[PDB]
Amino acid sequence: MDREEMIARFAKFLINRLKDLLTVTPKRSLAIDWAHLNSFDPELADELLNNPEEAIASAEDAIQIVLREPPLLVEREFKVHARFYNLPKTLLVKELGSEHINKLIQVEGIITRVSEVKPFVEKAVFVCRDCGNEMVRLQRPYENLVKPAKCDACGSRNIELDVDKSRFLNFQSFRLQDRPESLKGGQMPRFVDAILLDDLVDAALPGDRVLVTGVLRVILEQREKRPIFKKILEVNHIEQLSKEIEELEISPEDEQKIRELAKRKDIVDAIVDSIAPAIWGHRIVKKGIALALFGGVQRTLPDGTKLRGESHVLLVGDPGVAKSQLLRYVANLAPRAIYTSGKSSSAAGLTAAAVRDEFTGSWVLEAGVLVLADGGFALIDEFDKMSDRDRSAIHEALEQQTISISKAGITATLNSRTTVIAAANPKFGRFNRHKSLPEQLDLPPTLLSRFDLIFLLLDEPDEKVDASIAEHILKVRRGEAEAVTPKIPYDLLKKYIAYARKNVHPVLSREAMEEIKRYYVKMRKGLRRGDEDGVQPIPITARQLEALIRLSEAHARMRLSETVTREDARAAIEIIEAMMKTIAVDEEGNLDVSILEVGKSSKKINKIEKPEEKVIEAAKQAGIGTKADIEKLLNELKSDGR
Amino acid sequence: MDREEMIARFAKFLINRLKDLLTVTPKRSLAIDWAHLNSFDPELADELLNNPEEAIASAEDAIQIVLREPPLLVEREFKVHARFYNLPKTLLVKELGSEHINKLIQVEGIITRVSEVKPFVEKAVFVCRDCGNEMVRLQRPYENLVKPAKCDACGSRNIELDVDKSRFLNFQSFRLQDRPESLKGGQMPRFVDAILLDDLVDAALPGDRVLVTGVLRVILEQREKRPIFKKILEVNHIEQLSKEIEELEISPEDEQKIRELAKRKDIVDAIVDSIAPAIWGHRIVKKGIALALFGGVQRTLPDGTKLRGESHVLLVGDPGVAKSQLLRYVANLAPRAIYTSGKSSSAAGLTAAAVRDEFTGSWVLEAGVLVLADGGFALIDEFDKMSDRDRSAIHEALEQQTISISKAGITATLNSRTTVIAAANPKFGRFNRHKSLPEQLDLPPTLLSRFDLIFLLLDEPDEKVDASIAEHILKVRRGEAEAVTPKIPYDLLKKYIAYARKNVHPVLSREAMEEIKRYYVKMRKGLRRGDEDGVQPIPITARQLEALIRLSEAHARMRLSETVTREDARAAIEIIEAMMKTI
Ligand SMILES: Nc1ncnc2c1ncn2[C@@H]1O[C@H](COP(=O)(O)OP(=O)(O)O)[C@@H](O)[C@H]1O
Ligand SMILES: Nc1ncnc2c1ncn2[C@@H]1O[C@H](COP(=O)(O)OP(=O)(O)O)[C@@H](O)[C@H]1O
Ligand SMILES: [Mg+2]
């Protein structure tokens, strides 16, 4: 409708926006604002949403005249795509339906899958020797194979493709899903597959918050029915979502009561009691999860490296200790949390992997729970039952917070900046106190060196602790008030965590620096003298020193304090000392578990032990171990071939 | 268009290049300069980028007349290829898009895969059993064998292949990637598949930075999948990258600043402090890494050998000593250094591998970090974790700087001129001083001799160094600048290594040769008798002194000195004597 008139209307609104483009020649696009066009010509901006097919084409040719007419006109009239980044309304992937088809929409979400840089032909010239050479059957990259039945010029059927005169363009297809931060309330990860064109290809990675704004197109992929079978959003402009929309927002009236709650006494005790009030006990585990929620400060050094600011927690224990429930109450309490299980229900269930799509068979990089939850939390239940592919990449995603996959024709790196509050189960049914943790845990020994807090939620029969948990469960089932309700409401506490992780950034103080120093040197020489003439036990490692500073800064952020008070660094010591008992202390002495084992004894005996009817007796009178211990030693040696 | 006019245009410009053609009679491809054609006719030269199919066809056909009509002509119309070794814009691999298909492009980069010689057909004359065998079809090397449905002469379908009259020509396919050293900031390992014709077959090997100038084709037609979405690149001329473009830039003002840093005092200690300022301690270890950065000179002796200048260093330490950190700060600081781990998911994470390609199932030789970083450094953490093929292949890459791989029909000999900065981890938990290193390290004993320096890092529970490293670690996290500001800027010190290795070439002096001959005989002959006869322990030795010559010349190159003075040799003793101290 009035295409020639729209060109004059677009040229009228077109000039400071085209003025800078007139200066920068290599810029192959033009970012146009809809609200700006709405102010100049509201009727013209209304035609953008109504008929986007005739509006984008007429605007491109119009601004071309606004380009050649003034000075600094480029020699070659490069394609000027009209990119309308802003729109009056912002839609949702769940809210998106068949009504917005062929309408200029602006849907927000997160990209989960993405294809390679697949070239596609724009002007499909078919080579017909008989006649009809330069004829073009304009095909879209998502559309199926186009082929004419007969040449209209000469009636010949010798049809073939002329890829020598064909002008090929770039094309990429991604999958836009609901954001797990706020749109997860619907509990439906709906997806709308979209396409990307020149200056849009390779503009966003999977697991990233983007605000795409394009035309909702359709494709008749199936011939079983005349109506469309699948809709594909033809993205006109892509843009990453702003910080305010992709993060939790707090009302100004709540900003006062959040600061008021920080000034309230025993704020640390109130938050601990407010985390999972149904489960009894585990106050050390509750405070450890609280320190993981109020994660430490994440700083970047000018040398290029970036200091870690997350505290991963692992909950190992026997079945029946409500270790899976603890991953539920925090799943809804945390601002950005993706509750999932260790089971590899998908190819990219835990870590992002590459899988061939069902549409064209091309490998697409699908994100995982450790990618969609970037800058948030990911509570992984049953962490001991994982696939071999996921077990190999979590070693890098937990420390470096990056997932570099370079297989299946997809090479890139993601940002796995997530706090993995996981919970694993022992492979022997119940955890034994006479064996180390990796001995009964399916996780690799190197993987345990990544978690800053590893609590042992063991089951121990005691008349005092069992009578309290028995009466507590009865109060929960009876509907008691103070047995289920938290001291701080979940709605306010969810904003309290987001307020601390965004505004309050504590810094180390001289008082806390002396406490962190005195604690680290105190653990040294704790058990090294014990295993002399061999591998001396290292009670604490510099890795754990960085974890101690993260927990000390975590307690200061939980109190909404801009500095690490000496009392805050002391609180992290108690939590570390409590975990010491669980592992690396109060068990096979210090250094227990460590990277693999204490070594104080096991490793020590390994070097002494290092047609075999003579070697079994030789180990007998040697006195290195009893006949039962030296028996089990060679079973593990035969496991590795020794 | 105007193909007849283009032939007259090319023949008009067609001078000195043809003068070279008469000199070398077997010249199947004559090289033509672009600036000579651009100055002759910019409109004619512009037609080469728009449609090179008709441009290169009319260019060779026009000079074919110049091959016959002028005197000294060839007896027949000898096939000549219009080779072009220059273009106005040199594009990049990541910058190359689908908008350059069917256009003459000039893209630079490195090669990682190279196939063998495949005698594919150029024009397959399909013989029909009944009649009509006269028909032909221009078979392409990148495309598979095509098959027409029926014959036009008699309409018969009894078609068969005729390998007698078919002209089979040489064909090779290679994979050209981005630069791993120059474009490390781009972080894009993208590649474009390319084919090599008769003149360019076996031209380069994987790990060779070349500057190809060809036409971006397209393989959109595929029998397996019609929406193949694949674009290939036919190359017209290949040429290795020049040092002006394939290395870091050093301006004359910058070269002055680098010379000014040499006039600055105590840079022999400031360089050690600047390398990885976040991690505390390791004065001798950090100085050893600096000693490896300014590697020794490489001189080809008249006897056929060459003095190795790649001073390999190994950092065997315990977990928690931040060894990996040291491999990170130096990787970005070094001019040519790519970070990689021991375990790798690719085909060749190391020197070389052999596996059939995914396109046609042909065996292609793959490349790794020890060849992509030739002329530089390669830092590999988890060096102890490596496959059986890795352990045997590196020994030739480290010591002899060569990669001899002839399996799977890929006859090739790569040159791995790399200075490796490795860091192994003993399998028996924490490293125990009581038992030796080879008992705790899976590395072969001869591999340890390849590393000139071996630092035994450790984390001792000494409250003295603990309180010092705890106060230092707190300073790094607190944001203190002193902990994260090097004595020499990272960008300035990166140019300091390139200017030192390229220009400064220290030569042996009497003062250094006497100290290197004194310190050798007071220690080698001192413990030569060894103990209890049998296999006597060998401290310093010929190979040790060799490495020791690298250590003395590295100190002179570190301070931008052409003469290795005795104190530069004395500084070499302080580092090598610590090696027997720590080990
Ligand atoms: N401290 C506790 N307070 C209340 N219930 C508990 C507590 N510890 C364990 N339980 C009980 O354990 C049962 C199973 O919990 P669950 O989360 O399935 O543990 P797991 O998954 O390890 O088996 C629940 O019915 C819960 O009531
Ligand atoms: N001299 C030092 N200065 C600062 N940090 C150190 C030092 N030595 C060890 N560290 C600690 O070691 C940790 C990194 O060690 P890492 O390289 O991961 O060892 P590994 O490779 O065996 O796992 C860092 O968190 C750092 O705090
Ligand atoms: Mg490491």
Side-chain angles (χ1 to χ4, degrees), chain A residues 1-3 6-11 15 17-18 20-24 26 28-40 42 44-45 48-52 54-60 62-72 74 78 80-128 131-143 145-159 161-163 165-167 169-180 182-201 203-223 227-253 255-355 357 360-406 408-459 461 463-526 530 533-585 587 589 592-594 597-608 611-612 615-616 618-619 621-626 628 630 632 634-635 638-639 641, chain B residues 8 11 23-24 26 31 35 39 42 44-45 48 52 55 57 59 62 70-71 82 87-88 97 99 101 103-104 108-109 119 124 132 141 148-149 153 155 179-180 185-186 189-190 192 194 203-204 206-207 214 217-219 227 232-233 237-238 244 248-249 252 256-257 259 262 270-274 276-283 285-293 295-296 300 302 304 308-309 315-317 319-322 324-328 330-335 337-339 342 347-350 352-355 361 367-373 375-376 378-381 383 385-387 393 395 397 400 408-409 412 414-424 426 429-430 438 444-445 447 456-457 459 461-462 467 469-474 476-479 481 483 485-486 488-490 492-504 506 509 511-512 526 530 534 537 539 542-544 547 550 554 556-557 561 569 571-572 578:
Chain A
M1 300 179 181
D2 54 277
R3 173 179 174 86
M6 289 182 178
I7 291 181
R9 293 191 64 182
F10 274 114
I15 205 178
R17 156 168 282 100
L18 278 84
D20 62 356
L21 175 48
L22 187 61
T23 76
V24 50
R28 312 188 310 172
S29 314
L30 174 63
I32 311 179
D33 201 291
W34 187 94
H36 292 183
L37 185 61
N38 188 25
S39 303
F40 283 101
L44 184 64
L48 263 51
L49 313 180
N50 300 330
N51 313 68
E54 67 177 8
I56 300 179
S58 78
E60 168 162 355
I63 67 162
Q64 270 283 349
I65 311 178
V66 177
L67 207 169
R68 52 184 179 91
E69 170 189 1
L72 311 97
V74 306
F78 67 102
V80 287
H81 316 83
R83 268 69 193 273
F84 306 136
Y85 53 93
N86 191 263
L87 272 191
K89 298 182 57 182
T90 298
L91 283 86
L92 282 66
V93 187
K94 182 254 302 182
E95 194 181 355
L96 195 53
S98 280
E99 184 263 340
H100 307 96
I101 290 180
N102 205 29
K103 303 295 182 179
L104 189 62
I105 58 184
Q106 187 184 31
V107 57
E108 64 175 4
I110 181 171
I111 298 182
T112 55
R113 298 184 178 183
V114 63
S115 316
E116 295 89 355
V117 194
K118 296 309 211 310
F120 90 103
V121 53
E122 173 71 23
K123 283 294 196 303
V125 292
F126 297 84
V127 50
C128 180
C131 191
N133 205 237
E134 60 94 22
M135 65 174 182
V136 306
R137 287 162 49 95
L138 285 88
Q139 66 98 32
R140 304 199 184 94
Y142 62 91
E143 291 179 349
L145 321 180
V146 287
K147 266 301 180 179
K150 197 205 66 176
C151 166
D152 197 281
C154 64
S156 45
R157 210 156 283 101
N158 47 3
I159 176 62
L161 200 43
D162 181 353
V163 300
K165 206 153 190 322
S166 294
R167 33 173 290 186
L169 272 69
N170 280 314
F171 152 70
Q172 193 180 45
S173 87
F174 72 96
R175 170 167 295 189
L176 184 77
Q177 293 194 5
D178 285 306
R179 297 186 295 180
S182 87
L183 294 101
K184 203 201 280 295
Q187 299 181 185
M188 288 201 62
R190 297 178 184 262
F191 69 101
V192 176
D193 286 359
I195 59 181
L196 293 173
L197 275 298
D198 300 350
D199 204 2
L200 304 162
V201 61
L205 273 301
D208 292 354
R209 271 75 177 179
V210 299
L211 179 55
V212 296
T213 169
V215 177
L216 188 59
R217 285 307 178 185
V218 290
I219 169 179
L220 190 55
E221 53 95 12
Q222 264 285 343
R223 309 303 172 180
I228 313 303
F229 286 78
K230 180 194 173 187
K231 54 177 181 180
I232 290 182
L233 170 66
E234 178 192 8
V235 166
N236 168 263
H237 175 95
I238 190 175
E239 180 185 10
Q240 289 202 14
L241 283 152
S242 43
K243 304 306 293 178
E244 55 93 20
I245 184 62
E246 76 196 9
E247 297 297 336
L248 194 141
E249 293 305 301
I250 183 167
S251 60
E253 57 92 15
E255 298 172 2
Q256 179 65 29
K257 76 201 311 180
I258 286 300
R259 279 277 192 258
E260 174 187 0
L261 191 64
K263 301 179 181 60
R264 173 192 172 185
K265 205 57 182 61
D266 57 87
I267 178 61
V268 177
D269 304 71
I271 298 181
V272 168
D273 301 4
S274 279
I275 293 182
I279 182 180
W280 172 92
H282 308 276
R283 297 189 57 83
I284 299 302
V285 190
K286 284 183 179 180
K287 187 169 296 182
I289 294 180
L291 296 181
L293 295 178
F294 304 95
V297 286
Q298 178 182 3
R299 312 179 196 260
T300 172
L301 305 179
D303 313 298
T305 175
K306 283 75 180 182
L307 302 177
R308 211 182 84 176
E310 290 82 10
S311 315
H312 315 274
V313 186
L314 183 62
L315 283 81
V316 177
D318 303 358
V321 303
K323 74 165 64 61
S324 315
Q325 304 181 17
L326 273 173
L327 299 190
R328 316 305 296 268
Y329 301 101
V330 185
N332 57 85
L333 180 57
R336 182 182 303 178
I338 302 180
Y339 178 66
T340 179
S341 315
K343 299 298 207 316
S344 278
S345 316
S346 158
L350 274 301
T351 303
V355 56
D357 72 327
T360 79
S362 45
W363 302 92
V364 293
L365 177 54
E366 185 170 356
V369 294
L370 292 187
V371 183
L372 303 182
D374 50 330
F377 307 92
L379 302 97
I380 307 175
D381 194 9
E382 306 174 2
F383 199 73
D384 71 276
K385 322 167 188 176
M386 297 176 308
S387 87
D388 291 278
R389 176 173 48 184
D390 303 328
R391 286 175 175 267
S392 45
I394 51 178
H395 288 45
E396 183 193 4
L398 263 61
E399 63 185 342
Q400 300 180 359
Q401 308 176 73
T402 63
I403 302 181
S404 69
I405 172 168
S406 177
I410 320 182
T411 183
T413 177
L414 305 178
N415 303 129
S416 48
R417 302 164 297 185
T418 77
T419 299
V420 184
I421 306 179
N425 300 117
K427 57 177 178 295
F428 294 98
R430 300 173 304 195
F431 181 77
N432 179 23
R433 275 300 183 179
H434 297 269
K435 296 182 178 300
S436 162
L437 179 60
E439 301 183 18
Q440 312 179 62
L441 198 60
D442 216 339
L443 304 182
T446 316
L447 178 64
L448 268 69
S449 159
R450 272 55 189 176
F451 299 89
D452 299 334
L453 286 176
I454 302 180
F455 305 101
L456 279 186
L457 282 83
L458 76 163
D459 197 3
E463 275 279 353
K464 303 305 292 178
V465 309
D466 189 90
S468 315
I469 194 180
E471 205 270 339
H472 191 103
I473 291 181
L474 287 169
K475 291 187 305 182
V476 169
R477 294 284 301 192
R478 200 179 184 177
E480 212 273 345
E482 55 89 24
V484 57
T485 192
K487 295 185 177 181
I488 305 177
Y490 270 71
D491 300 0
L492 192 139
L493 190 52
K494 190 174 186 297
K495 303 175 179 298
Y496 188 86
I497 301 175
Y499 189 90
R501 293 172 55 91
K502 183 191 304 178
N503 306 124
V504 172
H505 301 275
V507 303
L508 298 168
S509 159
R510 181 55 58 176
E511 307 174 5
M513 278 181 61
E514 188 179 359
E515 190 72 20
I516 298 181
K517 279 178 58 178
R518 73 170 67 249
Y519 179 73
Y520 189 74
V521 299
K522 170 184 174 183
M523 310 280 110
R524 306 321 286 255
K525 306 300 221 312
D533 302 68
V535 184
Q536 44 195 20
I538 307 289
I540 191 176
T541 307
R543 197 117 176 181
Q544 282 190 323
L545 181 57
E546 187 84 9
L548 175 63
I549 308 168
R550 285 191 292 253
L551 294 182
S552 72
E553 295 165 337
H555 196 273
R557 176 180 285 186
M558 182 166 51
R559 211 181 53 185
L560 260 57
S561 162
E562 294 285 343
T563 186
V564 188
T565 297
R566 161 71 70 89
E567 312 294 330
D568 301 330
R570 181 68 63 88
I573 286 177
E574 317 293 332
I575 297 303
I576 284 292
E577 280 278 358
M579 178 198 57
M580 287 293 83
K581 288 176 286 296
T582 74
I583 36 77
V585 137
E587 187 186 5
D592 184 24
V593 176
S594 62
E597 88 295 343
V598 65
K600 176 172 56 182
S601 178
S602 175
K603 178 59 60 181
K604 286 289 288 294
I605 312 165
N606 289 117
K607 66 189 261 172
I608 313 302
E612 283 83 12
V615 309
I616 47 184
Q621 53 268 358
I624 190 54
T626 174
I630 69 184
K632 305 304 295 171
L634 62 89
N635 295 62
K638 186 56 186 180
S639 315
Chain B
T23 63
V24 49
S39 57
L44 174 72
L48 268 75
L87 272 191
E99 63 273 356
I101 301 189
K103 289 202 286 297
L104 185 65
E108 62 175 357
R179 301 288 317 288
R190 315 181 196 170
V192 303
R217 285 293 188 89
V218 56
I219 309 194
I232 200 164
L233 161 71
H237 173 93
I238 186 155
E244 182 85 20
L248 186 62
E249 52 95 15
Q256 170 62 221
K257 192 165 304 180
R259 279 272 193 261
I271 284 185
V272 192
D273 262 357
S274 47
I279 174 177
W280 164 92
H282 308 274
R283 170 65 58 173
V285 185
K286 287 180 182 178
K287 193 177 303 177
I289 303 302
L291 215 63
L293 291 177
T300 296
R308 152 195 160 190
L315 275 73
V316 173
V321 193
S324 305
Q325 292 294 350
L326 282 171
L327 302 187
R328 318 199 81 85
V330 176
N332 56 84
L333 181 56
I338 176 64
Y339 202 92
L350 289 91
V355 57
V369 287
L370 296 200
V371 56
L372 263 50
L379 295 89
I380 307 90
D381 54 337
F383 192 77
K385 288 310 143 172
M386 40 186 179
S387 87
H395 199 68
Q400 296 77 12
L414 304 178
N415 302 130
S416 198
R417 296 153 295 185
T418 43
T419 318
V420 286
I421 302 180
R430 272 81 179 188
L447 177 46
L456 271 186
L457 277 72
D459 189 11
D462 184 20
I469 201 179
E471 193 263 354
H472 197 100
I473 282 181
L474 283 165
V476 184
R477 190 147 178 85
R478 202 184 187 180
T485 62
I488 305 90
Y490 268 90
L492 192 149
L493 178 46
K494 187 178 184 300
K495 304 151 59 173
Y496 187 87
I497 299 144
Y499 188 86
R501 297 173 59 95
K502 184 64 61 58
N503 300 118
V504 175
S509 87
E511 320 168 79
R543 59 180 178 180
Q544 194 76 346
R550 289 186 279 264
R557 176 175 279 185
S561 189

